[PDB]
Design a protein around this ligand. Structure first.
Ligand SMILES: C/C(=C\CNc1ncnc2[nH]cnc12)CO
Ligand SMILES: C/C(=C\CNc1ncnc2[nH]cnc12)CO
Ligand code: NA
Ligand code: NA
Ligand code: NA
Ligand code: NA
Ligand code: NA
Ligand code: NA
Lengths: 163, 163
């Protein structure tokens, strides 16, 4: 009479970077705490590690510039060899008319022959409740924001090879 | 031996709109609750009035798309005749190394002969503490965000004369 229901809504976006997979990956994953505020000086005030050594299970916190609060990232998968990174957000993620259980952010960087890379981004929204309503603008906002972080880092690193 | 100290840091920006002062003012001030999400579908989820009839003393709340929280605006001055609007934000405004007492946002729209208007924006940061440290990127972030709201509304209204 009463099923358990869950939706998983996946959005995929790609773009081609002229920066190498290795460099972009290091920028975001290893050196993020320094690079995020430098790349996004008007959006990210601070990026810090609250728990863990940087591997799976690590908890990071981004604090945003202005009255936009802060958010924790819970690191799931860290694969330097394959330039792959996954983390989850658990809090402050509800819409007005759709609660969410979590949002998962995944990127994979794939080298191209030109020695740039394809940046493969994914966002996955996991729904809470017995039904589902998610708008195009929302679903787009999330993957654009995420891909926009990566793009900002790429631009900073091209501009500043030593940081 | 111990003074009371406060800083008031004022940032002023202008730009010229092709939309009339009257129309832009109505869009933001009178019709904001409908227009903000329509103009900024990927940033503002909802804009609502919590208390008051829209005049001075009114409290509005913007809810942001994604994990960026929400913020209350406390309406101070509402002058339709002069297309002027002022409100304050009190919460979620600290920097990591500088508490703030409040941020005041003011705009004045001045008709030009072309029947567009000059949009005069001001942000005022009121400091909390016995000393002061505020960076250029921060001070810029605030007035750019604010002027960016107004610009988004201007673009939506030019594109949609009936909403
Ligand atoms: C980025 C910063 C402020 C921007 N926030 C706002 N800017 C303009 N209007 C508002 N209403 C509520 N919050 C805002 C830094 O102070
Ligand atoms: C606009 C939306 C999400 C964007 N937020 C994030 N996007 C990418 N990485 C993150 N880390 C913490 N929060 C984020 C809507 O889900
Ligand atoms: Na902040
Ligand atoms: Na948050
Ligand atoms: Na469910
Ligand atoms: Na939100
Ligand atoms: Na807020
Ligand atoms: Na003081």
């Amino acid at each position: 009479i009463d099923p358990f229901t869950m939706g998983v809504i996946t959005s995929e976006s790609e773009y081609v970077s002229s920066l190498s997979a290795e460099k972009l990956y290091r920028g975001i994953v290893e050196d993020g705490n320094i690079i995020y505020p430098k790349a996004l000086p008007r959006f990210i005030e601070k990026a810090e590690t609250l728990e863990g050594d940087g591997g799976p299970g690590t908890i990071k916190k981004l604090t945003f510039v202005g009255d936009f609060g802060s958010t924790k990232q819970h690191i799931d998968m860290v694969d330097r060899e394959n330039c792959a990174y996954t983390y989850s957000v658990y809090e402050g993620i509800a819409l007005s008319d759709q609660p969410l259980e979590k949002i998962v952010f995944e990127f994979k960087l794939v080298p191209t022959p030109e020695e740039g890379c394809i940046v493969k981004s994914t966002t996955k929204y996991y729904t809470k409740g017995d039904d589902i309503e998610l708008s195009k603008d929302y679903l787009e906002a999330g993957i654009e924001r995420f891909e926009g972080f990566t793009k900002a880092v790429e631009s900073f690193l091209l501009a500043n090879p030593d940081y």
